């Protein structure tokens, strides 16, 4: 029952989805920022540096806006 | 008013001021309200000539404006029959006020602390927020 992963660390496998854990109900439901409204290169650099440091939220929203906005892209 | 009657009666002799004022009053005796009213009218004249590029309730009063109010009050008080020199000096001070309004000459400062009266922005431009300007240290 103690299934080992690829890295050889035993653990217990659970059928419950991690999001549906009754503890992350208010952090899995986020209304998107849409940061690509009035972007200035300074602010784009700021969000890129924030993503580099570890906070990937702004970068992901910016990428989503770039995907849906720029038709050639 | 910019100048008080105690200054108009000093720059211009009080006896001549009484001679000019005593007819205008109702009773016929030397009065002081006529001179104050003339000074108020001259101050209104100067205020109109200065409101072009100044906040008119002047924070600091230029020190020459006392002279410029006394001369205009004196001319306004000699309207029946003025001397040629009074008219010439009134034309000179009107020319100076026109130059101040146009921008050729600043009124001056307060002689005590050398402070110039403030005013509204003569020139004012608005543009869209700056993007791609050199202040954007990103990219480059």
Curated annotation (Swiss-Prot), chain A:
Transmembrane segments: none
Induction: Expressed in the late phase of the viral replicative cycle. Expression of late genes is activated by the viral late transcription activator C.
Post-translational modification: Cleavage by the viral I protease yields a C-terminally cleaved portal protein competent for DNA packaging and procpasid maturation.
Protein's cellular compartments: Virion; Host cytoplasm
Function: Forms the portal vertex of the capsid. This portal plays critical roles in head assembly, genome packaging, neck/tail attachment, and genome ejection. The portal protein multimerizes as a single ring-shaped homododecamer arranged around a central channel. Binds to the terminase subunits to form the packaging machine. Acts as a linker between the capsid and tail. Required for attachment of the neck proteins to the capsid.
Subunit annotation: Homododecamer. Part of the immature prohead complex. Might interact with viral I protease; this interaction gives rise to an early 25S initiator complex. The scaffolding protein Z and the capsid protein T should then be added to this initiator complex to yield the immature prohead. Host GroEL and GroES are also essential for the correct assembly of viral head and tail.
Name used for this protein in its record: Portal protein
UniProt source species: Escherichia phage Mu
Lineage: Viruses, Duplodnaviria, Heunggongvirae, Uroviricota, Caudoviricetes
Gene name of the encoded protein: H
Residues included from the entire protein: 2 to 74 of 512
From Swiss-Prot, chain B:
Region of interest: Disordered: 101-140
Predominant location category: host cell
Subcellular location: Host cytoplasm
Disrupted-gene phenotype: Accumulation of unattached tails and full heads.
GO cellular component, one term: host cell cytoplasm
InterPro entries named among the record's database cross-references: Phage_Mu_GpJ
Keyword rRNA-binding attributed: no
Induction: Expressed in the late phase of the viral replicative cycle. Expression of late genes is activated by the viral late transcription activator C.
Domain of life: Viruses
Key words, A-Z: Host cytoplasm, Late protein
The protein's name: Gene product J
Source species of the chain: Escherichia phage Mu (Bacteriophage Mu)
Gene name for this UniProt entry: J
């Amino acid at each position: 029952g103690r299934i080992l992963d690829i890295s050889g660390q035993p653990f217990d496998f659970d059928d419950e989805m991690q999001s549906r854990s009754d503890e992350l109900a208010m952090v899995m439901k986020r209304t998107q920022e849409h940061p690509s409204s009035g972007v200035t290169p300074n602010r784009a650099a700021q969000m890129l540096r924030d993503a580099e440091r570890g906070d990937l939220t702004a970068q992901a929203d910016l990428a989503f806006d770039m995907e849906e906005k720029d038709t050639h892209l | 008013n910019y100048a008080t009657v105690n200054d108009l009666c000093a720059r211009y002799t009080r006896t001549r001021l009484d001679i000019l004022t005593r007819p205008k009053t109702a009773d016929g005796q030397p009065d002081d309200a006529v001179a104050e009213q003339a000074l108020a009218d001259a101050s209104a004249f100067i205020d109109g000539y200065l409101a072009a590029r100044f906040v008119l309730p002047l924070t600091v009063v230029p020190s020459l404006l006392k002279r410029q109010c006394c001369v205009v009050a004196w001319f306004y008080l000699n309207e029946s029959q003025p001397t040629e020199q009074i008219t010439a000096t009134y034309r000179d001070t009107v020319r100076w006020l026109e130059q101040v309004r146009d921008g050729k000459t600043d009124p001056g400062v307060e002689s005590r602390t050398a402070a110039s009266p403030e005013g509204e922005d003569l020139v004012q431009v608005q543009s869209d927020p700056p993007v791609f300007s050199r202040k954007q240290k990103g990219f480059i």
